[model samples]
Target: ASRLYTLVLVLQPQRVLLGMKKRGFGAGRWNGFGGKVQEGETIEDGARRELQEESGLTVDALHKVGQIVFEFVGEPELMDVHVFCTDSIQGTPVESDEMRPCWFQLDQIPFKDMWPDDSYWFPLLLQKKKFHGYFKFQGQDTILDYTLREVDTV
Candidate 1:
């Protein structure tokens, strides 16, 4: 069975907001804010809630920017993560039990400290291009093979 999830990136003219996950699935990595979708909540709602829960900010608006399928070797389940981007928000980013918030200049993203797959689609995202990607991972940090492309719509 595949599970659905959401990831939201807060972007500004020259910087993007990311969280240092303190625990759980992507712990020890810098990632956009997101998590599992609840049964009755919309994907966008779940993305908003996860961002607030992880970064202490409320999203004013969001745009669906990309979607990714993360399949691990020998695992029956895949993670279908819908991605969003936003520049409108309210409140200051405060560290939460789940994440430590930080801002990175667009040119200085710490790809080395993020999930390997992030490097694949993030540039297209920052360029305001819609994208879809499929990644086959050997483990947490190694991507065995993948395919990605920009799209007219996500």
Candidate 2:
């Protein structure tokens, strides 16, 4: 299992901005404002801290959106994903070595610069509709052979 994070920052009307990590995964590409949960940190705490560290935005509250499970050939094991959404937050965006804050205007999001799987369920969370998704890809190709198991929303 992997503890992931995200900050739902409303940068503009009906538009939310996510910070992109510049050091790992799709480096230099756009992604949500967060990273993996540290060993000593709670998932929510890690999400808050990572959001602040990556974008300088402090969230007042967050809702658990959904979860994703991914597995790929050649990879050692399956990976789990935790998703959260925040509509209210505090602080102005800032820059850091791991992230560079940028705005994505809802329908105009730069999908090309994001992980291919993100384009699947990310938009659903943006719309306040919870969902679960699965992705199995060797590298970047979308090979839909994984399962998406849904759980009751909180």
Candidate 3:
């Protein structure tokens, strides 16, 4: 079985917003803000809601930039995530119970504390490129195999 989720990457010209997840699936990792899509919610809507719920900023809009399929070796579930990016955000980002919001310069992103697959597709996102990727993970930290490519549209 597979689950649908959303992730919103808030970006500025040279800075990006990331959150330190305090608990749950990607706990202890720095990542974009978002979570699972709820019933009757569109992907974009869910992304915006998750972002605001995790961080304190409200996203006015999101540009669909990518999609990633993650399959864990020992798990029967797959995660289908729709990735969104935007610079049109409102309000100050505040730390929530679920995450601690932080901003990083483009060159100073802490990838070492993020998911391993982030290094592969994150550059493309910063370049304003659309992409799609499939990653097979051995566990939470190792990517057994993967494929990533820039696409004309997401």
Candidate 4:
């Protein structure tokens, strides 16, 4: 079974917010704010909790736009990620113990510093398109195979 996780993106008129993970699984990567679902909390609640914990922004209405299944070659397990985004936010992002948050221009999103699969689905996200993806990675920087498709519903 794929382990459940959430990934939240905050978008604005001309930019998006991302965090540089300071430690743990995605340390050194520019990524959305989120993590694994905890016991008793729903997936989206976990998304909200993680976002607040990692970026200091409390978001109320997250739009679910995509789902992605990631397979890392060295591990036997899979990660099933629910992707959400929001244009509305309540507070300024702060640097937390686990992340350093920053905003990037829409045209200058630092994809090179993000997960390899991001380059494939991010455009769809930018357009508010619904999608589902499956990515098999040989390692952190190499995608062995992938399937990305826009859908009416994710």
Candidate 5:
């Protein structure tokens, strides 16, 4: 299997709703709405599918933000996060077997329950800034290492 992809979705109410898996990996904690890509599934297809599965949201026009090559420093796993932005979508978020939906005010998200690195780059994406980031996590012990790079500067 390839690396997992996490999705960050913006709700119409002007709040950011992040989805958390109820069990496994992100058990009982909030996170981006996403999971492992099925065999032969393209990144675009997987992103659209994951939004529906985890957040009950649909993308009207999703644009690429950037990709992250994350190393699960705590779990010996690797991840490739495809960050995207969608100003329009359908449906409201609901709790599921794999996710619990929660909304956060601008810059008021709860980061303690999520991977420490989330706080760093997530805000940038929300600002519509394009960039790349790398993250190394050691479970809930906080990120071990991280780096960010901005591209397309002219």
Candidate 6:
């Protein structure tokens, strides 16, 4: 069975807010903020919880932009990652125990420090396009294979 996870990116006119994970699963990567969903929580609620905890910011709502399924070469479990974005927020983002918040321009996203699949999907996202994709990773840094495309609805 696949497990549920959520990732959220806060966007602005020409930039996006991302977090450099301080530790744990995605340590050393500059990416969106989120993780595993907990029992009894709606996926949307789980996303909100993660965003609040990791960034000290809250949004009125999220726009679902994409969904990705990730498989690791030697791992048995799969991750169903729901992706969302929101530009309207209630507080300035600040560092948390698990993430250090930062903003990057649309032209300056640090894909080298992020998951390889990010390069495939992020720019399309900034174009306001929705997508669905799969990524098979070899350990942490390599993409053994993948498929991604634009969609009308997430």
Alpha carbon deviation, residue 118, candidate 3 (Å): 0.2
List candidate 4 segments past 4 Å from native: none
Lowest lDDT 10-residue stretch of candidate 2: 2-11
lDDT per residue (tens digit) for residues 18-83 in model 3: 999999999999999989999999989999999989987897779999999999998888999999
Better candidate number, 1 or 5, judged by TM-score: 1
| lDDT for each residue of candidate 2 in 9-109, tens digit (9 for 90 to 100) | 44345777766777976686787766667788887787788788777788778677777767777777666666777768787788888888876678888
Q: What lDDT score belongs to each candidate, Candidate 1 first?
A: 0.93, 0.70, 0.93, 0.93, 0.72, 0.93
Report the Cα lDDT for candidate 4.
Answer: 0.93
Backbone clashes for every candidate come to 0, 0, 0, 0, 0, 0
Clashing pairs in 3: none
Q: Per-candidate TM vs. native?
A: 0.97, 0.83, 0.97, 0.97, 0.84, 0.97
Comparison by lDDT, 3 against 5, better one:
3
Clashing pairs in 1: none
Tens-digit per-residue lDDT, 6-94, candidate 6 = 99999999889999998899899999988899999999899999999999999998999999999998888899999999998889999
Residue 91 shift from truth in candidate 1, angstroms: 0.4
The runs of at least 3 residues in candidate 1 whose Cα sits more than 4 Å from the true structure, single-residue gaps closed, are none
lDDT of 1 by residue, 1-154 (tens): 8999999999999999999999998899999999999999999999999999998899788999999999999999899999999999899999999999999999999999999999889999888899999999987988998999888878
Which parts of model 5 have CA positions greater than 4 angstroms off? 1-4, 11-13, 74-77
Find the 10 residues in a row with the least total lDDT in model 6: 120-129
lDDT value, residue 127 of candidate 6: 91
**Per-model C-alpha RMSD:** 0.8, 2.6, 0.8, 0.8, 2.8, 0.8
In candidate 4, what are the lDDT values of residues 65-127, reduced to their tens digit? Answer: 999999999798899999999999999999999899999999999988888889999999998
Better of 1 and 2 by lDDT: 1
Error of 2 at 6 (Å): 5.9
Which pairs of residues collide in candidate 2? Answer: none
- Candidate 6, residue 116: Cα displacement in angstroms equals 1.0
lDDT comparison, 1 vs 6, better candidate: 1
